Amino acid sequence: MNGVYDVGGTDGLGPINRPADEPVFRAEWEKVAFAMFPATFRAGFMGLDEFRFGIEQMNPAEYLESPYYWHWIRTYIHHGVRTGKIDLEELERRTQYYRENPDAPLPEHEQKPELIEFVNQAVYGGLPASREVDRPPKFKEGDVVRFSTASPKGHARRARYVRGKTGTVVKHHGAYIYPDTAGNGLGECPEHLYTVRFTAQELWGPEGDPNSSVYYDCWEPYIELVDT
Amino acid sequence: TENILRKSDEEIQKEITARVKALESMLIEQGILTTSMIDRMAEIYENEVGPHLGAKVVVKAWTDPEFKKRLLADGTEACKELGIGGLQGEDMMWVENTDEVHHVVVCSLCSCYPWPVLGLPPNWFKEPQYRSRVVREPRQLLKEEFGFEVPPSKEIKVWDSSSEMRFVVLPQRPAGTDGWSEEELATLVTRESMIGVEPAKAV
Ligand SMILES: [Co+2]
């Protein structure tokens, strides 16, 4: 989608706010928001691509100025409601309850060893998106390609700043989960992945740095051949 | 930036805390989230996984030309030699800074970052300001924000992580470090040097 979240190239966002140092978690709620990622993933709320799409659909003004982990909370609620796993009305009732009673206890619950096992496995083993496909790669290193000008309303990894631009294939990484299908609940539908080099001049016109290039990853359908 | 429509940081924190505890209570009742699961995830990224891991990879590459070749050929496989890898680092591609080239990484579309070697990203990396400007004015940004002046003649390669491939910068080894031990060299490798916003520590 042509969301405001796609900030690459956007002007007027202001200076970088960078403290000399900071903690990993600035508040207890952040630790909870963070841990909810593997929890909701295991529960089938969404996959990684869908996770991103939920954030992309946020109110832009809220996205631009809210604490980072709040974005995660928004996507959990988004998918919880989508899948019917979260009743919004009950969530709103409970929110007011904790506003009035912030120190009220959490529900009694049993600890589950399977959830710790999942955490350790996911953290140290990872969640690889690499997949094997039957089709051979259409492109190769050195090929000059042009990025699609398509503008899907659903999830995609097509930054507005690279659309319609011409670049050179730097490397073929093999096939991976395709965002355009995965983030929209249409499955993995793996596609070959390539890193493509775009000169700053090609991307920004004369306002671009005469000696700079941007490397951007493109799934096969994103690019078409110009010169072999 | 100032926004006359925005509540105070205190009110914002109070609202978020209530909303998160509410959502937390519901996921707990559903049996998909537990207090131990939360504590374990927090424990890992607060004490176990961090930039000291990436520093180990960097110093091995600086002192082992063969490992350096393997690292640049396949980052994931190379880091596995040191027992480093996992979540959000399943696919890593390391890029080497030289006298002619400088690399800098970003996730313009969100906040993608190589957690296995750098831990969780600092807030500025995830925010709109850095993400929007680095792909458009990298040279000016590095100088203005990080006090790092990269010569106009030296090429700046910006790596935008639009896929699951995670890019990590192998900074140049600082001069005056001939014969240093891997432990001594590690004191010069910063999280910033592996993102490309700063070179490794001088001297
Ligand atoms: Co990201």
Swiss-Prot record, chain A:
Q: What superkingdom heads the lineage? A: Bacteria
Enzyme category, top tier: lyase
Q: Which reaction does it catalyse?
A: an aliphatic primary amide = an aliphatic nitrile + H2O
Keywords, ordered alphabetically: Lyase
Q: Which GO terms describe its molecular function?
A: nitrile hydratase activity; transition metal ion binding
How temperature affects activity?
Optimum temperature is 60 degrees Celsius.
* Extent of the signal sequence: none
Task: Write one Pfam family the protein is assigned to.
Answer: NHase_beta_N
Among the record's GO biological process terms, what is one? nitrile catabolic process
Subunit and partners: Heterotetramer of two alpha and two beta chains.
Family per record: Belongs to the nitrile hydratase subunit beta family.
The name under which this protein is listed is Cobalt-containing nitrile hydratase subunit beta
UniProtKB/Swiss-Prot annotation, chain B:
Instruction: Identify the SUPFAM superfamilies for this entry.
Output: Nitrile hydratase alpha chain (SSF56209)
Residues binding Co(2+) are: 107, 110-112
Spell out which residues are annotated as carrying Cysteine sulfenic acid (-SOH). Answer: 112
GO BP term (any one): nitrile catabolic process
Q: Which InterPro entries match?
A: CN_Hdrase_a/SCN_Hdrase_g_sf (IPR036648), CN_Hdrtase_a/SCN_Hdrlase_g (IPR004232), CN_Hdrtase_asu/SCN_Hdrlase_gsu (IPR023900), Nitrile_hydratase_asu (IPR018141)
Where Cysteine sulfinic acid (-SO2H) occurs, the residues are 110
Temperature dependence (free text): Optimum temperature is 60 degrees Celsius.
Q: Which GO terms describe its molecular function?
A: cobalt ion binding; nitrile hydratase activity
NCBIfam families, per this entry? nitrile_alph (TIGR01323)
Protein function: NHase catalyzes the hydration of various nitrile compounds to the corresponding amides.
Q: What is this protein called?
A: Cobalt-containing nitrile hydratase subunit alpha
Q: Which organism is it from?
A: Pseudonocardia thermophila
**Source organism lineage?**
Bacteria, Bacillati, Actinomycetota, Actinomycetes, Pseudonocardiales
